[PDB]
């Protein structure tokens, strides 16, 4: 079965999403 | 420790007689055992095959009861065959 | 064969295996039964799903993360939403389709390996310790062997340490069913079939059979009983007395059968 | 499907003839050897044209 | 077997069934090749993939 | 998973149906051994396959 | 015909030193080219070991030029050891 | 499936492969140590290929 | 696809970087046929090693 648990190279996706989320907060702040 | 086949037949040959000489009238339906006990005296190549197989089969066609001298005598010059199959 | 040779007994009945070594000293009949060696090893448990193995594929790290992650997507839509929107998109897509693959690659290599095919494949792996009886036409047939790989088989068995041989049917079997697949079993085509079909039915039969030959019934060189019998056996072949016989007494009643 | 029923092929002699029981022997260890399934696989599946 | 019995051939080599029948006129060396009655039919140019 | 495993499996009607069906003929050899089992067969089957 | 171990080995030794004896003097650098020919001629049951494989080592160690006949009249009863491999 | 078949190895591993199957022809020099090698080789695989 | 198949990475510093780096030190046994290779080869790279 070989069990994967890819969390690392996930990992990565999930940092380009905080990143986005990010810009977000900033976008969402310099409009108000 | 060589074998040498040519000792390991005459060995067989001499064995296998000197067995069949103890079944006296019996001789033609001893002939495998005894030829079993040739083949464990004197070892042979192949386990199956036994240490000259030619002799054993020209003994097993040939010899009847109490006909067993002639035919050994008659047996034992005959070529064994192929002693590795 | 001993009681039959120095006469204590007039005929021998029973799973008798045929070889030359005992052709030369008895007389054997045409064969009742047909077996062969054969493989026996222990049967995969069928299933043990739980509901871990939904969380098999996707790390325990992952799901964390993604909870987190959903969280703070909506704590950042609470306070430019496009973005996120979309943000979110690509990041649920990956994960979707990382999840889909690597299940995908869970049940592709699940459905990809078998454990064992054929006798070849025991002489090709060190993992699984196999044997056979500490005697028999079995041994004497694996150790006058020729044959490359059941030659290599032999040296395996007669030089690994523990020894793999064991004294009697049942222990083999036992230790088959001990040793959690790590051991296999080499018998008659015939008692696999038997065990294979008695409680708990845990046991089953690999392959083909490694050798082709029968049992029979012994009776002494020149011996009167010689020819009856052997003509009765035929007749019993014939009739399907022996057919109907085998399935008497192996699959009929047999509780797993 | 399956096999009806479960017989074999046969080498035949004349009853009392001295070729037999060598014929017999011969069978056997042809059949220990490997001889028979050798040629069997010979004859029939190593040139089998259907995979 | 003919052939064998009223012996105009020393010895018969061929895919001879061993039967009981056979078995009493003359002897039968210990069975060279295994086989059964079995069936043949045409094999199907395709299967129904179904629903 | 299944598309990768490409597994093909081929049923068959073995010898009991055949006994039951009259839309596929059989048959067997003119004479010998398979055609005396038939004959002679006490079996429910093989029997009515005769008849 | 039939084969003979026995019956090869005593073909195996003469062809040998027949062949030899063409090659006097510089007799022990030709012992492996005679056996050679003497396998062929006498035959072999593994093309690789020879007529007689005990015979032919004896002879190598043991031949020295001019000494030829002393040498293999010592060697030629000598074990040939198992012709298989 | 396909990109799985794609990626997936095992075409070819040993010189046992080509003993094990009959699609792929081959061959040797006319003469030579390679032809003369099979010849004389008395272990299984290469006996086989000889053949 | 490439879950199912994985793969393997196969890194080889080689000979000459041995004699290019300072970070990981090397060495051969207190005497024997390499040591004596090392002492006279007329190499550039193994010369360098040596030294
Ligand atoms: C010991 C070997 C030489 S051998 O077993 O004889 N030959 C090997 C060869 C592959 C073989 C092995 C086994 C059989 C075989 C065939 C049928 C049976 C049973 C079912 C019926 N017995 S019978 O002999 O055919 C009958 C007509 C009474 C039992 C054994 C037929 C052929
Ligand atoms: C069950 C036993 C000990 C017997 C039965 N047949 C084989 C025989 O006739 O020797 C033996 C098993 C074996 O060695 O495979
Ligand atoms: C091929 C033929 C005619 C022979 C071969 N064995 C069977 C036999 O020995 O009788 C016959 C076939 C059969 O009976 O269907
Ligand atoms: C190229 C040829 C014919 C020579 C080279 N080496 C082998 C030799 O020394 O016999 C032969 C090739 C071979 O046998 O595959
Ligand atoms: C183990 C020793 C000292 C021996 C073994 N082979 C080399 C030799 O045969 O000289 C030496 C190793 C070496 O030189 O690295």
């Given at each position: 079965?070989?069990?994967?648990?890819?969390?690392?190279?996930?990992?990565?996706?999930?940092?380009?999403?905080?990143?986005?989320?990010?810009?977000?907060?900033?976008?969402?702040?310099?409009?108000? | 420790?060589?074998?040498?086949?040519?000792?390991?037949?005459?060995?067989?040959?001499?064995?296998?007689?000197?067995?069949?000489?103890?079944?006296?009238?019996?001789?033609?339906?001893?002939?495998?055992?005894?030829?079993?006990?040739?083949?464990?005296?004197?070892?042979?190549?192949?386990?199956?095959?036994?240490?000259?197989?030619?002799?054993?089969?020209?003994?097993?066609?040939?010899?009847?009861?109490?006909?067993?001298?002639?035919?050994?005598?008659?047996?034992?010059?005959?070529?064994?065959?192929?002693?590795?199959? | 064969?001993?009681?039959?040779?120095?006469?204590?007994?007039?005929?021998?009945?029973?799973?008798?295996?045929?070889?030359?070594?005992?052709?030369?000293?008895?007389?054997?009949?045409?064969?009742?039964?047909?077996?062969?060696?054969?493989?026996?090893?222990?049967?995969?448990?069928?299933?043990?799903?739980?509901?871990?193995?939904?969380?098999?594929?996707?790390?325990?790290?992952?799901?964390?993360?993604?909870?987190?992650?959903?969280?703070?997507?909506?704590?950042?839509?609470?306070?430019?939403?496009?973005?996120?929107?979309?943000?979110?998109?690509?990041?649920?897509?990956?994960?979707?389709?990382?999840?889909?693959?690597?299940?995908?690659?869970?049940?592709?290599?699940?459905?990809?390996?078998?454990?064992?095919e054929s006798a070849e494949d025991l002489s090709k792996q060190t993992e699984?310790?196999?044997?056979?009886?500490?005697?028999?036409?079995?041994?004497?047939?694996?150790?006058?062997?020729?044959?490359?790989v059941?030659?290599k088989?032999?040296?395996?068995?007669?030089?690994?340490?523990?020894?793999?041989?064991?004294?009697?049917?049942?222990?083999?079997?036992?230790?088959?069913?001990?040793?959690?697949?790590?051991?296999?079993?080499?018998?008659?085509?015939?008692?696999?079939?038997?065990?294979?079909?008695?409680?708990?039915?845990?046991?089953?039969?690999?392959?083909?059979?490694?050798?082709?030959?029968?049992?029979?019934?012994?009776?002494?060189?020149?011996?009167?009983?010689?020819?009856?019998?052997?003509?009765?056996?035929?007749?019993?072949?014939?009739?399907?007395?022996?057919?109907?016989?085998?399935?008497?007494?192996?699959?009929?009643?047999?509780?797993?059968?």
């Open positions: 079965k070989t069990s994967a648990l890819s969390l690392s190279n996930v990992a990565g996706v999930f940092y380009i999403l905080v990143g986005g989320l990010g810009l977000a907060m900033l976008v969402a702040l310099i409009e108000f | 420790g060589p074998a040498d086949c040519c000792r390991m037949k005459e060995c067989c040959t001499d064995r296998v007689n000197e067995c069949l000489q103890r079944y006296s009238g019996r001789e033609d339906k001893f002939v495998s055992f005894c030829y079993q006990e040739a083949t464990v005296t004197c070892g042979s190549f192949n386990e199956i095959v036994g240490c000259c197989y030619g002799y054993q089969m020209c003994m097993i066609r040939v010899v009847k009861p109490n006909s067993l001298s002639g035919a050994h005598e008659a047996c034992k010059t005959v070529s064994c065959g192929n002693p590795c199959a | 064969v001993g009681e039959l040779v120095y006469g204590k007994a007039d005929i021998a009945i029973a799973p008798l295996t045929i070889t030359l070594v005992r052709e030369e000293v008895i007389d054997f009949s045409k064969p009742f039964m047909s077996l062969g060696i054969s493989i026996m090893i222990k049967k995969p448990q069928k299933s043990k799903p739980g509901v871990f193995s939904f969380l098999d594929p996707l790390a325990y790290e992952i799901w964390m993360a993604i909870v987190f992650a959903y969280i703070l997507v909506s704590v950042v839509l609470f306070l430019s939403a496009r973005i996120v929107a979309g943000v979110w998109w690509f990041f649920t897509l990956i994960i979707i389709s990382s999840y889909t693959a690597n299940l995908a690659a869970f049940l592709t290599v699940e459905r990809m390996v078998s454990p064992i699984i310790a196999y044997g056979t009886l500490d005697s028999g036409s079995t041994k004497e047939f694996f150790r006058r062997s020729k044959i490359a059941f030659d088989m032999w040296t395996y068995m007669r030089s690994a340490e523990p020894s793999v041989f064991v004294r009697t049917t049942a222990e083999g079997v036992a230790r088959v069913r001990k040793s959690k697949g790590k051991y296999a079993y080499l018998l008659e085509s015939t008692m696999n079939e038997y065990i294979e079909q008695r409680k708990p039915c845990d046991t089953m039969k690999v392959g083909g059979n490694l050798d082709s030959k029968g049992y029979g019934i012994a009776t002494p060189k020149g011996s009167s009983l010689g020819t009856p019998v052997n003509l009765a056996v035929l007749k019993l072949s014939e009739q399907g007395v022996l057919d109907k016989l085998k399935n008497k007494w192996w699959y009929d009643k047999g509780e797993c059968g």
